[PDB]
């Protein structure tokens, strides 16, 4: 897969959110 999900999710965990991939990049979500 073309997206670093774990590296995103642990970054979002600083902000208190979850990380989710979207095609070719990753974004944080509070859900």
From Swiss-Prot:
Annotated spans, [R/K]XCQ motif: 6-9
Tissue specificity comment: Expressed by the venom gland.
Alphabetically ordered keywords of this record: Amidation, Calcium-activated potassium channel impairing toxin, Disulfide bond, Ion channel impairing toxin, Neurotoxin, Potassium channel impairing toxin, Secreted, Toxin
Modified-residue entries (Tyrosine amide), positions: 31
Location of the protein in the cell: Secreted
Major location category of this protein: secreted
InterPro entries: Scorpion_toxin-like_sf, Scorpion_toxinS_K_inh
A GO term, aspect molecular function: ion channel inhibitor activity
GO cellular component terms given for this protein: extracellular region
Disulfide bond positions: 3-21, 8-26, 12-28
Effect on the protein of changing residue 6 to A: Small decrease in cytotoxicity towards Jurkat cells. In r-R6A-R7A; 1.74-fold decrease in cytotoxicity towards Jurkat cells
Further remarks about this protein from its record: Negative results: does not show inhibition on KCa3.1/KCNN4 at concentrations up to 50 nM.
Family (UniProt): Belongs to the short scorpion toxin superfamily. Potassium channel inhibitor family. Alpha-KTx 05 subfamily.
Function of the protein: Blocks small conductance calcium-activated potassium channels. Shows activity on KCa2.2/KCNN2 (IC(50)=0.0243 nM), KCa2.3/KCNN3 (IC(50)=1.7 nM), and KCa2.1/KCNN1 (IC(50)=42 nM). Induces cell death when tested on human T lymphoblastic leukemia Jurkat E6.1 and human breast cancer MDA-MB-231 cell lines which constituvely express KCa2.2/KCNN2, but not on human peripheral blood lymphocytes (which do not express KCa2.2/KCNN2).
Recorded domain comment: Has the structural arrangement of an alpha-helix connected to a beta-sheet by disulfide bonds (CSalpha/beta).
Protein name: Potassium channel toxin alpha-KTx 5.4
Protein species of origin: Hottentotta tamulus (Eastern Indian scorpion)
């Amino acid at each position: 897969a073309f997206c670093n999900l774990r590296r995103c999710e642990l970054s979002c965990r600083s902000l208190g959110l979850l990380g989710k991939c979207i095609g070719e990049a990753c974004k944080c979500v509070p859900y």
